[PDB]
């Protein structure tokens, strides 16, 4: 079974689920049947803009984790490698989460045996505060009234407390400096085929989740969840499986256009990069947030590299060194740019360097299961 249409058998889960609640039903089955010891997911805080990671040990009250949070640009790989390493686990992953976990698994920081990946289709995420400012400026509503959010026919659309829907073309918002994160606009991966399962709504009807099973482990998950009646499944029309392929191809083409824009046409000049690098406060937030920078002790803090004075570091010994260390394994997750207190576009340069390396060698960070050719023991 390559493709399925699944939805939860519990009425509460399907009601609260974004797309029929199949993902929540899989997690509930996995915890209830003890396939895994825990589930790492998101859970909204005091509003839709506040998604906090949660590690559930049992399925009691799991429906609180239902729904999609487009304003939660979270990374799970770093949490799975820092603290959850010796646990059997099931985690909801966007394609960037799966890419980070794959890059960490090929470096033996995460055990692929112990981690189950129910990946989600991702068309992009938004920064919460920026999203609220956008809703105030363009939707002319109080952001606290928004109860849900989705992107679709090119449209950010918001469900409301009243019950209506407000729609704005995402092209307009992204041309006005808003909308999805800039790294999300360049994202070339939409279905997480580097995960065990790939669940989305691009080939599904209302109330159903379109699932692509990528691995035999995904097949075991789906079989165990259907046999016990946690999930009910049907098979997409192959007219649907083609609409999904076309949508994905269009999205990837738009991503390539945005790469040509941000990394070639609107790429800052050397003078603009000098202006940016003058700002750096040497806080190492980019290094800490980067999932691929996992080392117990970092070379950038050695006496012969670290900037001693309270001034901007030399861009070479900080940025160029981190680039030489991991820029072939950059997954364009944007976390480094997200956390930078100085608003430096780090991800642009790191993604451009990774793209040059990929064009030369053909290595895709976060997708290929092997190490980069840099670490090849052959004499290729």
């Amino acid at each position: 079974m390559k493709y399925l249409l699944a939805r939860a058998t519990d009425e509460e889960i399907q009601r609260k689920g974004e797309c029929g609640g199949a993902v929540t039903a899989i997690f509930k089955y996995m915890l209830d049947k003890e396939v895994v010891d825990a589930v790492l997911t998101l859970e909204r805080g005091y509003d839709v803009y506040d998604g906090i990671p949660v590690l559930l040990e049992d399925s009691s009250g799991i429906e609180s984790t239902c729904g999609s949070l487009h304003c939660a640009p979270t990374m799970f790989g770093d949490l799975i490698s820092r603290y959850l390493s010796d646990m059997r686990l099931a985690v909801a992953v966007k394609p960037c989460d799966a890419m980070a976990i794959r890059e960490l698994e090929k470096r033996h920081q995460i055990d692929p045996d112990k981690v189950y990946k129910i990946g989600l289709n991702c068309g992009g995420t938004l920064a919460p505060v920026s999203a609220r400012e956008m809703i105030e400026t363009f939707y002319e509503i109080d952001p606290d009234d928004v109860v849900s959010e989705e992107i679709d026919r090119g449209k950010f659309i918001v469900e409301l407390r009243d019950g209506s829907h407000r729609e704005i073309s995402i092209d307009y918002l992204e041309e006005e400096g808003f909308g999805r994160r800039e790294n999300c606009q360049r994202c070339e991966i939409m279905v997480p085929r580097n995960a065990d399962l790939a669940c989305g709504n691009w080939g599904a009807d209302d109330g159903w989740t379109f699932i692509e099973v990528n691995t035999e482990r995904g097949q075991e998950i789906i079989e165990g969840a259907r046999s016990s009646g946690y999930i009910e499944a049907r098979e997409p029309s192959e007219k649907m499986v083609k609409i999904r392929e076309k949508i994905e191809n269009a999205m990837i083409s738009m991503a390539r256009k945005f790469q040509d824009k941000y990394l070639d046409e609107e790429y800052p000049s050397l003078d603009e990069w000098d202006e940016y690098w003058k700002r750096c406060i040497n806080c190492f937030a980019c290094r800490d947030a980067c999932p691929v920078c996992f080392c117990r002790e970092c070379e950038l803090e050695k006496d012969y590299l670290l900037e001693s004075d309270e001034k901007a570091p030399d861009p070479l010994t900080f940025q160029g060194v981190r680039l030489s260390h991991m820029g072939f394994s950059c997954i364009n997750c944007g976390q480094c740019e997200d956390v930078c207190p100085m608003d430096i576009p780090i991800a642009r340069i790191y993604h451009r360097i990774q793209k040059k390396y990929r064009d030369r060698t053909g290595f895709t960070a976060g997708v290929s299961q092997e190490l980069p050719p840099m670490y090849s023991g052959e004499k290729d």
Partner: protein
């Protein structure tokens, strides 16, 4: 303008090549300073970036010819790193002409002398970094 050039030369061939050039009394500009390593596989991007950040106008790396490595594969790893470094360097305003990596054998004194002369001329033409 006298450029400052830092060189890394493997013990077995490229250091031997510079020694051969010296024994034959082949003259090249005094700008280069050579640091000795056992293999070019010892060199990484950190060394090159440090040299450029400490004030080097050009950086030279000299290894054994592909297939001649005294440790049988070190220059392959170095070549990979050198290509990636060529990718990285222009992103920070360093012309990749300032970074020269060559294969020199222990008997190629003339090759070493010519490489040093041309690298010095190139870096001098480029000007201060």
């Amino acid at each position: 303008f006298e450029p400052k050039i830092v060189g890394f030369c493997c013990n077995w061939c490229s250091y031997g090549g510079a020694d051969t050039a010296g024994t034959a009394r082949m003259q090249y500009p005094p700008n280069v300073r050579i640091i000795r390593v056992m293999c070019s596989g010892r060199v990484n991007a950190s060394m090159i970036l440090k040299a450029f950040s400490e004030g080097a106008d050009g950086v030279f790396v000299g290894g054994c010819h592909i297939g001649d490595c005294h440790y049988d594969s070190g220059n392959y790893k170095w070549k990979r790193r050198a290509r990636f470094i060529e990718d990285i360097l222009p992103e920070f305003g360093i012309d990749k002409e300032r970074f020269r990596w060559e294969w020199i054998s222990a008997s190629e004194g003339e090759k070493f002398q010519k490489t040093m002369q041309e690298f010095y001329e190139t870096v001098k033409y480029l000007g201060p970094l």
